[PDB]
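Repro case for the chain-ordering regression, as requested:
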Amino acid sequence: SSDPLVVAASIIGILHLILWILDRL
Amino acid sequence: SSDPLVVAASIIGILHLILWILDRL
Amino acid sequence: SSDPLVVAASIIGILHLILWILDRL
Amino acid sequence: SSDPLVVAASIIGILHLILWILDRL
Ligand SMILES: CCCCCCCC/C=C/CCCCCCCC(=O)OC[C@@H](O)CO
Ligand SMILES: CCCCCCCC/C=C/CCCCCCCC(=O)OC[C@@H](O)CO
Ligand SMILES: CCCCCCCC/C=C/CCCCCCCC(=O)OC[C@@H](O)CO
Ligand SMILES: CCCCCCCC/C=C/CCCCCCCC(=O)OC[C@@H](O)CO
Ligand SMILES: CCCCCCCC/C=C\CCCCCCCC(=O)OC[C@@H](O)CO
Ligand SMILES: CCCCCCCC/C=C\CCCCCCCC(=O)OC[C@@H](O)CO
Ligand SMILES: CCCCCCCC/C=C\CCCCCCCC(=O)OC[C@@H](O)CO
Ligand SMILES: CCCCCCCC/C=C\CCCCCCCC(=O)OC[C@@H](O)CO
Ligand SMILES: [Ca+2]
Ligand SMILES: [Ca+2]
Ligand SMILES: [Ca+2]
Ligand SMILES: [Ca+2]
Ligand SMILES: [Ca+2]
Ligand SMILES: [Cl-]
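-- result from build under test --
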């Protein structure tokens, strides 16, 4: 388990990469 | 909970994205 | 130890930087 | 505490931002 602020940051970062990929595609 | 260095890195990363968004807006 | 979603995000981020470096090289 | 792979990724990410800032400055 992780600090909630770390889990969030991890969610934010994954979604960021997903969005970037979909925008480039 | 997380290593303090991970919590910080998570803070740094969130603030980085926030600043980037506000700069682009 | 970390939340599995954090470990993944960490893997994703490391691989992302690796790929970016190899693409620029 | 965190998974060692997460602590590393956090180190990698902080150093990455540091280097980027110093390169832009
Ligand atoms: C492109 C659309 C805009 C995206 C904006 C992205 C910025 C999002 C802002 C960050 C939200 C982070 C939420 C963070 C939620 C943490 C919850 C907390 O209460 O626990 C604190 C712990 O440390 C105590 O153990
Ligand atoms: C755009 C403005 C400039 C932004 C610069 C961003 C770079 C910031 C530098 C990084 C600060 C990280 C602070 C890290 C704080 C960690 C605290 C520590 O004592 O615990 C170590 C643990 O691992 C032991 O369990
Ligand atoms: C360039 C090629 C495309 C790369 C796409 C990158 C996006 C990858 C998507 C993200 C996958 C994340 C997998 C996440 C796996 C988490 C496993 C889970 O079951 O546990 C949840 C815990 O929180 C419960 O404690
Ligand atoms: C610009 C110069 C080049 C920079 C390249 C950056 C890429 C660095 C590669 C990644 C190194 C990650 C090291 C990862 C070290 C993890 C240690 C491990 O043994 O534990 C595994 C745990 O999950 C078990 O609990
Ligand atoms: C160009 C913009 C790209 C932005 C991509 C990122 C967008 C992310 C948007 C918002 C997602 C917020 C998700 C925030 C999810 C927070 C999860 C949490 O805090 O954990 C709760 C704890 O009690 C359990 O660990
Ligand atoms: C283009 C530049 C963009 C830079 C965006 C990032 C700027 C971040 C600035 C500095 C914020 C430093 C915050 C550092 C916060 C450290 C928190 C910590 O180490 O935890 C203490 C432990 O005892 C509890 O877990
Ligand atoms: C321009 C695209 C660049 C994309 C770079 C990133 C690509 C990453 C690709 C996919 C890797 C997915 C790895 C996902 C690995 C998930 C590990 C996990 O969830 O932990 C399981 C737990 O039970 C134990 O902690
Ligand atoms: C444009 C390139 C920018 C690259 C910036 C990032 C460069 C990073 C370079 C390498 C640093 C590797 C640091 C790797 C440090 C690993 C720490 C670790 O695995 O923890 C050991 C555990 O037993 C305790 O938690
Ligand atoms: Ca906390
Ligand atoms: Ca430590
Ligand atoms: Ca933990
Ligand atoms: Ca969980
Ligand atoms: Ca492990
Ligand atoms: Cl963690």
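Ordering looks correct now. Chain B touches chain A at residues 1-2, 6-7, 10-11, 13-14, 17 (CB under 8 Å).
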